């Protein structure tokens, strides 16, 4: 057992052993990006891969070729922290080595010269954080992994609704990774069609002619030959003894001196057994059977040299005679059978307007680009570029694999583009399914859905970046002079960097990190979407893809999906899932060899998994690991049933692997209706981080994995002991084993302190270890927000009791005791960023001066001489954060204003008041001020004080490093000097700086002292440069936008408590909005007097079948019971014996669990610290489907000395009398979600109005009035509310004249309206009148 486990150990129910512990939850995001940006000395996907495709680039056959060498990534311009404050994107410069060779004219190739131009710069490409996010403009963003249809060929249906005949249809689609689509589809008439892209439908055979196939080769390829001999006079026929199946005799069919079948008897198994066994090769026939047969090849008249019959022309009893008398012994015909081999391709040729190669190539060109004339060179080139160019087409390897896979080939890799064979083989396979042999695919199966993520999608955006630079490079290499231009002159930077900046900036897949919660971050980075580029659209599909598919078991979560307009269009990644080598979704299983269950694990992709028979998660195996029962519930080929002991090939890894990180965090999930479970893991992520990181009394076990794997916590790099612990930083003196030989030293973790999140919540780290405590590698060193002691604590649990409380929980509303708001415990800290801009207007420059017209010193108290609010000033609504004034001269005031200025003597100023002031109603403490000034404008007073202070702090920080790192390094020098010259007391008298001189006798210890010297002087110099650059960055001109001189950003720390209106919910989809905040006097209490924190409504529980919230409440009740027991014994100071005796009893409980525990923990100093951490309650773990059972809960209630009912009697705090019936009380972990009321509440009397439409508009955040849409008008129309409606869309909004006439009347105390006409309609009259239309208002 570890070090931050020894502190507090969660009692774990659940029997099934963990065989594989949860891997890094951010595996997907971090892995994929690492592959994209990395030197790979071969083709595997990456920047190397993208390059190698387009490169080498060569000029227009001018034999001036530009080839690609290799690429490097410059160091980040700013590091993570730096890049965020200023607002740059976190990127690295991409430097690629290019070689320009020139071939002589005319050349057996070889070069006059080649300049090997060093790494031209082509933009900066963003970099991924340590924790899987990007920074685009100082704002953390996530790139959502996408789910789209796998490249390859897929045969589909479109049954039923088509045409209202039933019949069904069958279509094939060739979907390449890049390049045009190739669609093959049937119709009711059983004609094969093709359409490129989604374009005009065309007769399918046209592509064969484009591949230089004439009519004869199409028949030869798609059809068999029925050879007709003219032997003697009039017609024999080659008979295949099989051809006659699925047909009836056409005539007197006889051969071999015996009539096998006469006219009119269908050729069945009898007739075909006879023919095949009797070897009937040749039969004599009438001249009329070829009346329908189609002649195969071309036959011309040997004498006149004229065409008798063109290939694919049907013969007639007269047509045969014309080619029979010409001496033609062979006539090849088509075998046509509408059950087995249908005359499909034959009919297609009859619909084709083309004939030769250029004939079809034109019809393809004129379809793609109608309106412009076809050409010989145009039509030929277009087709070769569509499916046969390495540049404009690629299936990739995965595309080639599924292609070969779906077609029953052997090669798993091959051509990257389609060949004449590839296209033909597909057309072949499509026909087979229509014949009844073979089945169609479905889009939904996760073996036909592929996962892309950041690493791949950036590659593609880089590839397009080059194709638009490639045109440009080829263009320059055409005319380029001799040895003057070099491969930098041609390659611009903006074109490359724009094509990649485009993606990470605005894309459906690049979004603001959902970061109010370590679960929210981790659940976002593990997310899928079938929307956006290359995926489905909400308006397209279509319920099948939204629905949960059987193949989702252990790959995609069935329960964690959004609840909105795109349900099932998102989904969330399952816990143990991983991405296949080929890019499919696989999941872990256990290899069941014969009847034993092994521990060697295998990853099976969606296609791989179907075949095998997989056992179940909850399956009892004992001793060697035989299946206990002779029959075990298992699932194999898409269904689930009971199976034999030794038929099972694999078994589920965990009881958990089907859900997501969100879903797995719900305790007693098994007991919760699936719908409400969705809402649970949906709202869990909306939990705003609390003031005091609690901890769930009722947990699942995952909370430690989510806290650590999410970056929010500070996890020990190397194991060792703590040298220094500050609320600011933590220094770890590394153990020797883990410590590297040189530079020695200590690991120093600088903590993140109070700072703004994306959702204005506060993200603050705190130290969770004390001075000189042992920590090992991979220990928890500091808690993030909403993490406690290494566990993920998204909220704070409290004492909850289910009962009606005089209606203050009517619907799902919640009733809360004052003790909660007094305890500041659901109090939540928010950080808003407010900025002031000094711009340039036509009239002049804005100044940030503190001289503000018509304001008293009351304002200028919180403002310094320069005009910026002081750090630390607690301000509320209206207080000025940054004084600002805009040039507006000669006001042209009116008489009565003029007379007023003369009576009271105000020097009517030539400057407007534009200062940044605190928004009405919100109130907090100023904790930081930043000033960004144009390069070359003089830093004002306060601005210079700040950039001086940032300097003094930065110098202190860097030197603190050196002081700790020196002493840490010198401390190692001291110990190696002691090994062969130990002068303990003699050594540390003299100045420590004067140590480097002491040497050592012949040994490696002489070479070891040598190592620490190098890295000392490097600390000495790396300090110097780290301090230097830091100093330049502060004074350097902060670069801004056009028109803007300087900007002040003020950061506020508002501390919001909790009030009626806030949305709160438990983890089981039980929402509720706190309704009244009650006095502790009025709360339900028990015979011990202890009030209850929340009073929930029992009605919310039966309807919404979330029964886990009750189990949670009871187990929570028992978990606090163990707490109350230890708290008494710890206050009794009973001594280790009485305490340890009681703790040991708790962690076993009944028998058969998985827990294990002491007495190993050092029976004193370690055992006591634990007891403390438990007195608040004993943390229990209910795994997802391995959870606790009622008996274990009731049993733990016994130990806590609490009733098994889970219910007690309560007393009304007001009347003091008993409550009839026992009520349930207990502890339920509850979240406060960030739909906090004082963010939702808006009101407006009279505000801003839109220019175009004189209509209430939000401008100063005194927001626009409520919108009164169509349906709200029918409301007033259904009442008689004629005036209420007029006023609603006249004076209250649209009537530019009426609104002021009204407001004046309102204050005069006359409630009337003088309405007139809405400007909305006034503009229509003009808008219509400005068309050719004379629209008037008639009459009177």
């Amino acid at each position: 057992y570890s070090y931050t486990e020894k502190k507090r150990i969660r009692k774990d129910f659940g029997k099934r052993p963990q065989v594989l512990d949860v891997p890094y939850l951010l595996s997907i995001q971090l892995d994929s990006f690492q592959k994209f940006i990395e030197q790979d000395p071969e083709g595997q996907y990456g920047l190397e891969a993208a390059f190698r495709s387009v490169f080498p680039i060569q000029s227009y056959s001018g034999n001036s070729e530009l080839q690609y060498v290799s690429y490097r990534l410059g160091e980040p311009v700013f590091d993570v922290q730096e890049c965020q404050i200023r607002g740059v994107t976190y990127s690295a410069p991409l430097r690629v080595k290019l070689r320009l060779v020139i071939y002589e004219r005319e050349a057996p190739e070889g070069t006059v010269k080649d300049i090997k131009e060093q790494e031209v710069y082509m933009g900066e490409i963003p970099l991924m954080t340590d924790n899987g996010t990007f920074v685009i403009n100082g704002t953390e963003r996530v790139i959502v992994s996408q789910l789209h249809r796998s490249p390859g060929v897929f045969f589909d249906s479109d049954k039923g609704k088509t045409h209202s005949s039933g019949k069904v249809l069958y279509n094939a689609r060739i979907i390449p990774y890049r390049g045009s689509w190739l669609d093959f589809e049937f119709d009711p008439k059983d004609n094969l069609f093709v359409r490129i892209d989604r374009r005009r439908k065309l007769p399918a055979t046209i592509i064969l002619r484009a591949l230089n196939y004439t009519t004869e080769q199409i028949l030869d390829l798609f059809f068999e030959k029925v050879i007709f001999e003219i032997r003697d006079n009039k017609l024999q026929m080659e008979l295949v003894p099989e051809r006659l199946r699925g047909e009836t005799a056409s005539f007197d069919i006889e051969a071999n001196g015996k009539v096998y079948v006469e006219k009119g008897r269908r050729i069945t198994a009898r007739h075909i057994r006879q023919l095949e066994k009797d070897d009937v090769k040749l039969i004599e026939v009438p001249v009329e059977y070829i009346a329908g047969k189609v002649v195969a090849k071309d036959y011309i008249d040997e004498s006149t040299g004229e065409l008798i019959c063109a290939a694919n022309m049907e013969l007639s009893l007269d047509l045969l005679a014309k080619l029979s008398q010409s001496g033609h012994k062979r006539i090849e015909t088509l075998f046509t059978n509408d059950l087995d081999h249908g005359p499909y391709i034959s009919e297609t040729l009859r619909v084709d307007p083309t004939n030769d190669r250029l004939s079809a190539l034109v019809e393809i060109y004129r379809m793609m680009r109608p309106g412009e004339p076809p050409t010989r060179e145009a039509a030929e080139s277009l087709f070769e570029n569509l499916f046969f160019s390495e540049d404009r087409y690629d299936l990739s390897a995965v595309g080639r694999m599924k292609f070969n896979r779906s077609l029953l080939r052997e090669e798993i890799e091959g051509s990257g583009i389609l060949s004449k064979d590839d296209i033909i083989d597909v057309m072949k396979k499509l026909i087979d399914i229509r014949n009844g042999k073979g089945e169609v695919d479905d889009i939904d199966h996760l073996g036909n859905r592929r996962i892309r993520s950041v690493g791949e999608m950036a590659e593609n955006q880089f590839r397009v970046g080059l194709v638009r630079v490639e045109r440009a490079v080829k263009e320059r290499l055409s005319l380029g002079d001799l040895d003057t231009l070099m491969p930098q002159d041609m390659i611009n930077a903006k074109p490359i960097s724009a094509a990649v900046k485009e993606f990470f900036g605005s894309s459906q897949l690049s979004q603001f990190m959902d970061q109010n919660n370590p679960l929210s971050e981790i659940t976002h980075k593990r997310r899928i979407s079938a929307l956006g580029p290359g995926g489905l659209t909400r308006e397209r599909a279509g319920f099948e893809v939204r629905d949960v598919h059987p193949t989702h078991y252990g790959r995609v979560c069935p329960i964690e999906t959004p609840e909105g307009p795109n349900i099932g269009l998102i989904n969330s990644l399952s816990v143990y899932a991983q991405t296949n080598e080929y890019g499919f979704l696989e999941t872990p299983y256990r290899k069941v060899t014969d009847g034993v269950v092994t521990d060697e694990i295998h990853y099976l992709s969606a296609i791989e998994e179907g075949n095998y028979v997989i056992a179940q998660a909850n399956s009892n195996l004992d001793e060697e690991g035989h299946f206990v029962e002779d029959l075990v519930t298992c699932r194999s080929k898409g269904e689930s049933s009971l199976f034999s002991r030794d038929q099972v090939d694999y078994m589920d890894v965990s009881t958990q692997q089907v859900v997501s990180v969100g879903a797995s965090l719900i305790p007693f999930l098994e007991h919760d209706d699936a719908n409400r479970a969705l809402m649970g893991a949906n709202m869990q992520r909306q939990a705003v981080p609390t003031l005091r990181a609690d901890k769930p009394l009722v947990g699942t076990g995952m909370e430690r994995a989510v806290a650590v794997d999410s970056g929010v916590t500070a996890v020990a790099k190397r194991g060792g002991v703590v040298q220094y612990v500050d609320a600011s930083r933590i220094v770890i003196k590394v153990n020797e084993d883990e410590m590297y030989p040189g530079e020695a030293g200590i690991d120093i973790y600088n903590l993140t302190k109070y700072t703004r999140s994306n959702q204005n919540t506060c993200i603050n780290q705190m130290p969770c270890v004390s001075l000189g405590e042992p920590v090992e590698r991979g220990d928890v060193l500091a808690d993030g927000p909403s993490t406690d002691l290494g566990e993920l604590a998204l909220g704070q649990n409290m004492r909850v009791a289910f009962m009606p409380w005089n209606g203050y929980n009517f619907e799902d509303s919640i009733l809360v005791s004052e003790r909660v708001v007094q305890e500041d415990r659901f109090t939540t800290i928010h950080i808003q960023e407010l900025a002031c801009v000094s711009r340039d207007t036509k009239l002049g420059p804005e100044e940030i001066t503190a001289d503000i017209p018509n304001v008293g010193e009351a304002a200028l108290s919180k403002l310094d001489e320069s005009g910026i609010v002081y750090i630390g000033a607690e301000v509320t609504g209206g207080d000025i954060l940054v004084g600002k004034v805009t040039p507006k001269g000669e006001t042209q005031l009116t008489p009565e204003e003029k007379l007023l200025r003369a009576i009271f003597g105000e020097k009517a100023s030539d400057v407007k008041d534009s200062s940044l002031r605190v928004p009405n109603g919100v109130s907090g403490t100023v904790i930081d001020v930043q000033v960004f000034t144009r390069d070359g404008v003089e830093k004002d007073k306060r601005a210079l004080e700040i950039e001086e202070m940032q300097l003094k702090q930065a110098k202190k920080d860097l030197s603190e490093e050196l002081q700790i790192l020196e002493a840490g390094l010198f401390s190692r020098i001291r110990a190696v000097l002691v090994a062969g010259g130990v002068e303990a007391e003699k050594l540390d008298k003299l100045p420590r700086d004067r140590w480097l001189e002491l040497g050592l006798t012949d040994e490696e210890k002489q070479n070891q002292l040598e190592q620490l010297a190098e890295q000392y002087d490097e600390l000495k110099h790396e300090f110097e440069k780290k301090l230097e650059a830091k100093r330049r960055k502060i004074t350097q001109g902060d670069d801004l936008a056009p028109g803007v001189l300087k900007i002040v950003k003020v950061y506020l720390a508002v501390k919001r408590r909790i009030q009626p209106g806030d949305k709160m919910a438990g983890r089981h989809g039980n929402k509720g909005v706190i309704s009244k905040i009650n006095p502790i006097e009025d709360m339900p209490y028990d015979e011990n007097g202890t009030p209850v924190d929340i009073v929930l409504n029992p009605l919310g529980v039966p309807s919404r079948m979330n029964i886990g919230q009750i189990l949670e409440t009871h187990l929570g009740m028992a978990a606090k019971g163990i707490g109350d027991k230890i708290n008494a014994m710890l206050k009794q100071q009973q001594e280790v014996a009485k305490l340890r005796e009681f703790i040991q009893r708790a962690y076993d409980l009944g028998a058969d669990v998985r827990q294990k525990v002491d007495l190993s923990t050092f029976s004193d100093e370690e055992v006591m610290r634990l007891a403390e951490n438990l007195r608040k309650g004993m943390p229990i773990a209910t795994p997802v489907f391995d959870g606790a059972k009622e008996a274990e809960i009731k049993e733990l209630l016994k130990l806590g000395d609490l009733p098994t009912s889970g219910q007690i009697r309560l007393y009304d705090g007001r009347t003091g009398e008993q409550f009839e019936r026992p009520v349930t009380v207990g502890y339920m972990y509850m979240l406060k979600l960030n739909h906090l009321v004082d963010d939702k509440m808006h009101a407006r009397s009279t505000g801003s109005y839109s220019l175009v439409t004189q209509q209430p508009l939000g401008g100063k955040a005194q927001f626009g009035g409520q919108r009164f849409g169509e349906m709200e008008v029918w409301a007033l129309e259904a009442y008689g509310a004629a005036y209420t409606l007029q006023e609603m869309l006249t004076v209250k909004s649209d009537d530019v004249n009426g609104r002021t006439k009204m407001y004046k009347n309102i204050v005069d105390g006359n409630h009337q309206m003088e309405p007139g006409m809405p400007e909305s309609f006034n503009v229509l009259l003009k808008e219509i009148r400005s068309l050719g239309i004379n629209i008037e208002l008639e009459d009177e």
Binding site: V120, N492, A493, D935, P1042, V1252
Partner: protein, 51 residues
């Protein structure tokens, strides 16, 4: 026109792009006028731009 061209040679040459007071030196005039120039030089934006 001159201003777009100076930024080209100096786009890849200066790793990024020359400072607002660098092209000012390249160009013959008062060189603070670049701001004044660059302001009117922009085309207005389509009011019916989707947000």
């Amino acid at each position: 026109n001159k201003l777009n061209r100076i930024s080209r040679q100096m786009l890849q040459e200066m790793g990024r792009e020359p400072t607002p007071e660098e092209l000012a030196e390249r160009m013959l005039m008062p060189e603070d006028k670049i701001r004044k120039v660059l302001k009117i030089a922009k085309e207005p934006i389509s009011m019916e731009t989707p947000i």
